[PDB]
């Protein structure tokens, strides 16, 4: 059932990248992934669960892309590195970003687990970026603040009250204010 | 020149009261117009949507609170504390404002801007005990974003009020902690 999951999340990412939040239909994803619809619902009860899970997988893959050794001599530099990478990744995929941001907007208690998995991952990614070895509590907290700035400005990006570069500027400002 | 002002005041008062008692759903143009004793047409000329109503009312709220610690950290900590307690005393109002801010589009981008500048100012001056630096304004923005993100989590029952309070405290200490 692992390969089934892989096909389902693959189709989720493909469709989301192609047509944004709207295009992510349960029937369409199930179709594209060659699984029964009931199977899809059994693993993912909503498109929110689908998208958040897919996001989690994407983060888990990005963390496996290289290694903690792969940069900067200072915490500020390393965190700047991580945030910059994820930032350009965001800028390269506006539709996917729309789908994910919307998914986060609609995520409720029923998707708690899924969302948690994302939050735990991304924060970890930031924290381990700042730290040499095991991150401290404060670094986890800093990670959470950065994530909150990111999401809050994506909220304004989604409703076209702000551009992607505005988001990027806010992120850099936040990083500098926290550990610059 | 005074009829318009009185009208606006009653409109925002009604918005605050209704939002406080029933939340975002209860904020409807006819109900607001009714309570405020204005024509619905006048209300639509004044505020095109419930988002404009809630955002404007919030702005007036921060203006009013603005009207009537030995460090930046203590003063900001104090203010965020008071605002937090006020928030927990008014969950339906907070619900209404949160929905208003997550649902706000470009058509209210102007309004959303104004109140924003207001809110941050009140934070920043609190940090400065006077005229703030650029960085203090920036910090105010960061705090505001933490607030909004955690309020989104609260709205969708992914977090409690206590969670929100703790997150805001953490943000304050991490940003300007003594």
UniProtKB/Swiss-Prot annotation, chain A:
<keyword id="KW-0804">Transcription</keyword>
<comment type="subunit">
    <text>Homodimer.</text>
</comment>
<protein>
    <recommendedName>
        <fullName>HTH-type transcriptional repressor KstR</fullName>
    </recommendedName>
</protein>
<keyword id="KW-0678">Repressor</keyword>
<keyword id="KW-0238">DNA-binding</keyword>
<feature type="domain" description="HTH tetR-type">
    <location>
        <begin position="2"/>
        <end position="62"/>
    </location>
</feature>
<dbReference type="GO" id="GO:0042803">
    <property type="term" value="F:protein homodimerization activity"/>
</dbReference>
<keyword id="KW-0805">Transcription regulation</keyword>
<dbReference type="GO" id="GO:0003700">
    <property type="term" value="F:DNA-binding transcription factor activity"/>
</dbReference>
<feature type="DNA-binding region" description="H-T-H motif">
    <location>
        <begin position="25"/>
        <end position="44"/>
    </location>
</feature>
<comment type="function">
    <text>Controls the expression of genes used for utilizing diverse lipids as energy sources.</text>
</comment>
<dbReference type="GO" id="GO:0000976">
    <property type="term" value="F:transcription cis-regulatory region binding"/>
</dbReference>
<dbReference type="GO" id="GO:0006355">
    <property type="term" value="P:regulation of DNA-templated transcription"/>
</dbReference>
<dbReference type="GO" id="GO:0003677">
    <property type="term" value="F:DNA binding"/>
</dbReference>
